[PDB]
């Protein structure tokens, strides 16, 4: 089972297509679901082509055998969501990996900020260095950590907000977590940010 694409940007009024491939051939035993964040899934279409009562007519399912398409015509604001196919020819019942449809807007470069650990965090015995990428679009972004101008992997974690309801951007935190002894066996700390809105990777840094 293979659902594509993994993600998709569109505007209100567009027509979107999502596809599911099931190479073993599953006749018409496929359904489509919609899911919004923090909510239960909703069945849109079953038996490949049947629209569930109460689901808007702008949703249409097609296919038989190996390739299946969900077409969402004239996208409405309520349609920005994640979509999943489900195969039920055989057990185990299996879902596709999902397709997130988000809102298209113009490219916006992140504003990048770096936060040096407070004295009290250093007395903590564990220090967290935070790099903020603020209000960017599209979602795709890359963060690398550099200590003493040298690459560091393994001790960072990323967290991202949902698309902002006012300006349709994302924000992301990258947190580098080290022991106090380790925190400054080092001198200079930096994070380099790569994004489509930057003509070249931006680095913000500190030392002390």
């Amino acid at each position: 089972m293979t659902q594509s694409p993994v993600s998709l940007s569109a505007s209100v009024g567009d027509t979107v297509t999502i596809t599911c491939r099931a190479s073993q051939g599953i006749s018409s035993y496929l359904s489509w679901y919609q899911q919004k964040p923090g909510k239960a899934p909703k069945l849109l279409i079953y038996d490949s082509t049947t629209l569930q009562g109460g689901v808007p007519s702008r949703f249409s399912g097609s296919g038989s055998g190996t390739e299946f398409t969900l077409t969402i015509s004239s996208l409405q604001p309520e349609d920005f969501a994640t979509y999943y196919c489900q195969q039920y020819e055989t057990y185990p019942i299996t879902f596709g990996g999902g397709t997130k449809v988000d809102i298209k807007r113009t490219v916006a470069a992140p504003s990048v900020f770096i936060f040096p650990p407070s004295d009290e965090q250093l007395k903590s015995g564990t220090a967290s260095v935070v790099c903020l990428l603020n209000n960017f679009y599209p979602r795709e972004a890359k963060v690398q950590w550099k200590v003493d101008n040298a690459l560091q992997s393994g001790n960072s974690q990323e967290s991202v907000t949902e698309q902002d309801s006012k300006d349709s951007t994302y924000s992301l935190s990258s947190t580098l977590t080290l022991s106090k002894a380790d925190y400054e066996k080092h001198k200079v700390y930096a994070c380099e940010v790569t994004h489509q809105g930057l003509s070249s990777p931006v680095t913000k840094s500190f030392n002390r």
Binding site: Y29, Y46, Q86, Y88, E89, Y91, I93
Partner: peptide
């Protein structure tokens, strides 16, 4: 079929 495909 299985799941909702076997309710009948």
């Amino acid at each position: 079929a299985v799941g909702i495909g076997a309710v009948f």
